[PDB]
Amino acid sequence: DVELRVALPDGTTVTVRVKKNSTTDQVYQAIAAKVGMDSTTVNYFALFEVISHSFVRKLAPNEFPHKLYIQNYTSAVPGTCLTIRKWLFTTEEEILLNDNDLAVTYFFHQAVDDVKKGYIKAEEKSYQLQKLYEQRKMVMYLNMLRTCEGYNEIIFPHCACDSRRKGHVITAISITHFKLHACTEEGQLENQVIAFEWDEMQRWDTDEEGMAFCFEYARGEKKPRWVKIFTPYFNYMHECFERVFCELKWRKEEYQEPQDLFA
């Protein structure tokens, strides 16, 4: 048995004892039980690894959280490199949890932090959000922030792309689109953005050897094209695609027979 520490959205840390070779899902479930999640909330959060002050990476199911915890332990210092964050692209489903105290509290504290890191641009509504924040009117704060650009959008660090000769791309993933932002090889934005609709996606895959996430898209009646994004986080990006399409299909599900044409 070994100790593991994991940061929570409210800034507190939880300690759990796990088997050394526990996988992501086993560790996540142990944390969820300890913090009091139930069947109504456990599926909206996940384990992430803090990569930088501006990026966290979702652990894939075959990873071992203790291996990562101890690898970064000295670098992590007082804090840990493991953290629980929301895993949800469909903001509409988030609103339906506004009567769930644990969900609201976690969503709230993460949102406050995501505004401070510039992920969510709240400048237009800053005055009312500050008033709601100071009154700890969490639901009202979240309902307003949910209208702001960047809410529930995952931004990846800049990286090379086989479909741009010179320069990098910054990948931005939300339930509404998959976006690529042009930037320089040193991360400097170049004021150009391409948006892909999710229903334009045909196939996607990883290339472990080539360190790439790959997707095939087709706009209108044109032939499909593959794009390679040379991100170190290709497994995470792949899991974002899987999650988005999972959430889109769940939404559809929530809202002579066709199964035999012949009588």
UniProtKB/Swiss-Prot annotation:
It is found in: Early endosome membrane; Cytoplasm, Cytosol. Widely expressed. Expressed in cells of hematopoietic origin (at protein level). Residues 100-148 are annotated as: FERM-like region F2. Residues 152-252 are annotated as: FERM-like region F3. Residues 1-89 are annotated as: FERM-like region F1. Residues 1-89 form the Ras-associating domain. Involved in the retrograde transport from endosome to plasma membrane, a trafficking pathway that promotes the recycling of internalized transmembrane proteins. Following internalization, endocytosed transmembrane proteins are delivered to early endosomes and recycled to the plasma membrane instead of being degraded in lysosomes. Core component of the SNX27-retromer, a multiprotein complex composed of SNX27, the WASH complex and the retromer complex. Interacts (via PDZ domain) with a number of target transmembrane proteins (via PDZ-binding motif): ABCC4, ADRB2, ARHGEF7, GRIA1, GRIA2, GRIN1, GRIN2A GRIN2C, KCNJ6, KCNJ9 and SLC2A1/GLUT1. Interacts (via the FERM-like regions) with the WASH complex. Interacts with SNX1. Interacts with CYTIP. Isoform 1 and isoform 2 directly interact with DGKZ. Isoform 1 and isoform 2 interact with HT4R isoform 5-HTA(A). Interacts with MCC. Belongs to the sorting nexin family. The PDZ domain mediates binding to a subset of proteins containing a PDZ-binding motif at the C-terminus: the specificity for PDZ-binding motif is provided by the 2 residues located upstream of the canonical PDZ-binding motif. The PDZ domain also mediates binding to the retromer complex via direct interaction with VPS26 (VPS26A or VPS26B). This is Sorting nexin-27. It comes from Homo sapiens (Human). The gene is SNX27. The chain holds residues 274 to 526 of 541 of the full protein.
